[PDB]
């Protein structure tokens, strides 16, 4: 009887939603940055680019309402160097995500989405670990990920250019 967080593959029609969310300064403060001036063209170019061999773009849904976005990609090849993550034979996925409808913030939805997608990547992709790299100043997001079982592994100084500053991030990892 409990409402469920789910996700589904992003399709071309969802680019309308993405334009709405990523021209909303409330969202851009936490994802992409308020200095980014998105258009239909930039959204298409950036959100259909296949910059990894294995990438899934998904719409996060709560009670069938589309409320956010995630990108999930297998770390392979040069992608390991982007996290100074030592390559082994383990299968590693990284993820970025945002909730674009702010009325669904601070409801535990972020942590619950993390739990659902980790169980999916484990059971359907045999993922060994899932990694995240939130900004250190986003303690809300760090706390939410830790509640979903992501362990803090190490700090990533000057990791992410965000609104004109190189921000320190936190490497976080889920295994079980
Ligand atoms: N989490 C919030 C942030 O998430 C993304 O940033 C992520 C990059 O996408 C990843 O990089 C991959 O995508 C790049 C193109 O974007 C490629 O150049 C690169 N080779 C790819 O490995 C990088 N590893 C982690 C970083 N968190 C958004 O971009 C950023 O706006 C948003 O605020």
Numbering used by the authors: 3 to 178
Task: Quote the passages of the study that discuss this structure, keeping the authors' original sentences.
The monofunctional counterpart (AAC(6’)-Im) of the acetyltransferase domain of the bifunctional enzyme has been identified in both Gram-negative and Gram-positive clinical isolates 14. Here we report the antibiotic susceptibility and kinetic profile and the X-ray structure of the AAC(6’)-Im acetyltransferase in its apo form and as the binary kanamycin A complex, and classify the enzyme as a member of the AAC(6’)-I sub-family C. An analysis of the structural features involved in substrate binding provides insight into the modulation of the activity of these enzymes.
Strands β3, β4 and β5 form the base of the pocket, with helices α2, α3 and α4, strand β6’, and the loop between helix α3 and strand β2 forming the walls. The A ring is further stabilized by a hydrophobic face-to-face packing interaction with the side chain of Tyr34 which serves to help orient the ring such that the N6’ side group is positioned correctly for acetylation. At the opposite end of the substrate, the C ring is also held in position by a face-to-face hydrophobic interaction with the side chain of Trp54 from the α3-β2 loop. Despite the fact that there are only two sequence differences between the two enzymes in the vicinity of the binding site (Asp35 and Glu85 in AAC(6’)-Im are glycine and aspartate, respectively, in AAC(6’)-Ie), there is a significant shift in the orientation of the substrate in these two enzymes. When the kanamycin A conformations are compared it can be seen that in AAC(6’)-Im, the A ring (containing the N6’ site of modification) is rotated approximately 45° relative to the A ring position in AAC(6’)-Ie. This, in turn, moves the B and C rings in AAC(6’)-Im towards helix α4, Asp136 and Glu85. A hydrogen bond between the N6’ atom and the side chain of a conserved aspartate (Asp99 in AAC(6’)-Im and Asp105 in AAC(6’)-Ib) serves to orient the nucleophilic nitrogen atom so that it would be correctly positioned for direct transfer of the acetyl group to the kanamycin molecule in both of these enzymes.
